[PDB]
Amino acid sequence: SSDLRYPTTSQIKLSRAEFCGFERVDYIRGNLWYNEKCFANRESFEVD
Amino acid sequence: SSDLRYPTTSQIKLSRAEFCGFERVDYIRGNLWYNEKCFANRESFEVD
């Protein structure tokens, strides 16, 4: 998604990431890993 | 090749172009087309 803090069109605008050489049979075997950490007041050193 | 009119290292420096989605079975089936034209004095409107 483009971003969530700047509502402009009331509809999410998706951008497709590029991955060279990747067909459909690769995307069906692929996982997303993310560290669940809350950034409430958004200190400057906090990066996701 | 980098260029031919500015020799610097006495060895041709080749840069590999990118083709996202292309493996060896695609490179074995490919052809190069070029219009054989001589630009001796290299007029400004002449491009390759």
Swiss-Prot record, chains A, B:
Superkingdom of origin: Eukaryota
Subcellular location: Cell projection, Cilium, Flagellum membrane
Expressing tissues: Testis-specific. Specifically present in the principal piece of sperm tail (at protein level). Specifically expressed in the seminiferous tubules but not in the interstitial cells. Within the tubules, it is expressed in spermatocytes and spermatids, but not in spermatogonia.
Other known facts: CatSperb is absent in sperm from mice lacking CatSper1, suggesting that stable expression of CatSperb protein requires CatSper1.
Role noted for this protein: Auxiliary component of the CatSper complex, a complex involved in sperm cell hyperactivation. Sperm cell hyperactivation is needed for sperm motility which is essential late in the preparation of sperm for fertilization.
Quaternary state and interactors: Component of the CatSper complex or CatSpermasome composed of the core pore-forming members CATSPER1, CATSPER2, CATSPER3 and CATSPER4 as well as auxiliary members CATSPERB, CATSPERG2, CATSPERD, CATSPERE, CATSPERZ, C2CD6/CATSPERT, SLCO6C1, TMEM249, TMEM262 and EFCAB9. HSPA1 may be an additional auxiliary complex member. The core complex members CATSPER1, CATSPER2, CATSPER3 and CATSPER4 form a heterotetrameric channel.
Protein name in UniProt: Cation channel sperm-associated auxiliary subunit beta
Species this protein is from: Mus musculus
Residues of the full protein shown: 265 to 312 of 1109
